[PDB]
């Protein structure tokens, strides 16, 4: 599909280029108030993110009106406003960080390979990156991951041409195994651990909220349904329709940054600014739950 990238040209791209819907301003405000109630009211909240949450940073999505697959399907080159290294976390990224700090977010499941959740400061132990991360390479022998500052340079679980530097438990001489990228190609198996954690988080969630995914790729796209299957609610935030629209308790057609901005105001939380790449391996001890938010005027 990406020719020098060496990825499979046999992929089903799914449904590309559906038109975007925008809920009218009055209906948006009402729906976002309803989301805020649901966040507050709910104990276990899981977010599911896709490419739609990095469009504001200048990274294209896959199946939107100017998505990478959409353009390929109609014979055009994709367009990218920024590089992966120089992309900046959005308000949505930064909002999710704050929601995690205050205990309003149990787990975050993402299909994005852009590295922006990690670089935003979001704790890695509350994050499943189900399709990989451009910045993360992994040792074939011992499974040790390396988070880098620049993209590792291959895709499709290929060798990056660097070796493992871990000194072993008994002997403490270098492992030397082959480091590979973590970017899944079409029909590669997902990461065992990350999927299991995402699945368990999703099963036991009482609210799943999807942001900026069309939910066409499995198993990622079906994880938000497991929530509904055990009595939970499902909120879908997306400009295009999604594959699972019919199962949503609440559906919001608007820009995701707007929704998250309004969501945080209703909860009385500030969205932090971003200092720069800050890899956080373990979640900091929880901030106290904020004071009860005020009801709709």
């Amino acid at each position: 599909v990406n020719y020098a990238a060496g990825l499979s040209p046999y992929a089903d791209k799914g449904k590309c280029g559906l038109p975007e819907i925008f809920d009218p301003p009055e209906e948006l405000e009402r729906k976002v108030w309803e989301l805020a109630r649901l966040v507050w009211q709910s104990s276990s909240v899981v977010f599911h993110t896709g490419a739609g949450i990095s469009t504001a940073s200048g990274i294209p999505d896959f199946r939107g009106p100017h998505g990478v697959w959409t353009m390929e399907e109609r014979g055009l080159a994709p367009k990218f406003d920024t590089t992966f290294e120089s992309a900046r976390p959005t308000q949505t990224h930064m909002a999710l960080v704050q929601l995690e700090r205050v205990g309003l977010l149990r787990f975050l499941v993402s299909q994005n390979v852009d590295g922006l959740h990690v670089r935003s400061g979001f704790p890695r132990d509350k994050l499943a990156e189900l399709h990989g991360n451009m910045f993360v390479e992994e040792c074939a022998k011992c499974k040790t991951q390396y988070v880098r500052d620049t993209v590792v340079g291959t895709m499709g679980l290929k060798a990056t041409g660097r070796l493992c530097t871990v000194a072993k438990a008994r002997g403490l001489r270098a492992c030397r195994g082959e480091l590979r990228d973590t970017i899944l190609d079409w029909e590669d198996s997902l990461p065992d651990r990350d999927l299991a954690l995402a699945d368990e988080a999703s099963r036991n969630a009482d609210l799943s909220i999807t942001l900026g995914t069309s939910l066409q790729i499995r198993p990622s796209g079906n994880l938000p349904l497991a929530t509904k299957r055990r009595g939970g609610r499902l909120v879908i935030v997306n400009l295009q329709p999604t594959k699972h629209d019919r199962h949503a308790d609440l559906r919001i057609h608007g820009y995701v940054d707007e929704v998250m901005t309004r969501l945080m105001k209703h909860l009385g939380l500030e969205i932090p600014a971003w200092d720069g790449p800050r890899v956080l391996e373990r979640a900091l001890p929880p901030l106290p739950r904020p004071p009860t938010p005020k009801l709709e005027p």
Partner: peptide, 8 residues
Amino acid sequence: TARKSTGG
């Protein structure tokens, strides 16, 4: 081990 696809 579950695979990344559209599944249909």
